[PDB]
Amino acid sequence: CDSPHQILDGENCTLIDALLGDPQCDGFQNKKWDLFVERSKAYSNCYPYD
């Protein structure tokens, strides 16, 4: 349930890929949130990194 806490769905992005800005994760740019929800479907599409 979304209403009480600001939910931000990660979809195909991890929190890190959004922070670094994997081009597919450009929608999450500058977005604040109360709860991020990393998905299991989420992949990383850009440069290999650890």
Ligand X SMILES: *[C@@H]1O[C@H](CO)[C@@H](O[C@@H]2O[C@H](CO)[C@@H](O[C@@H]3O[C@H](CO)[C@@H](O)[C@H](O)[C@@H]3O)[C@H](O)[C@H]2NC(C)=O)[C@H](O)[C@H]1NC(C)=O
Does 9 bind ligand X (CB under 6 A)? Our answer is no
Question: How many helices (H) and strands (E) are present in the chain, helices listed first?
Answer: 1, 2
> How many chain residues bind ligand X (CB under 6 A)?
3
Residues of this chain, 24-43, that bind ligand X according to CB under 6 A: 24
- 3-state class of 18 per DSSP? helix
Does 44 bind ligand X (CB under 6 A)? Our answer is no
Instruction: Name the residue nearer to ligand X (CB basis): 4 or 23.
Output: 23
**40 with 15: CB under 8 angstroms?**
no
Place of tokens 């290999």: 48
Binding stretches for ligand X (CB under 6 A): 11-12, 24
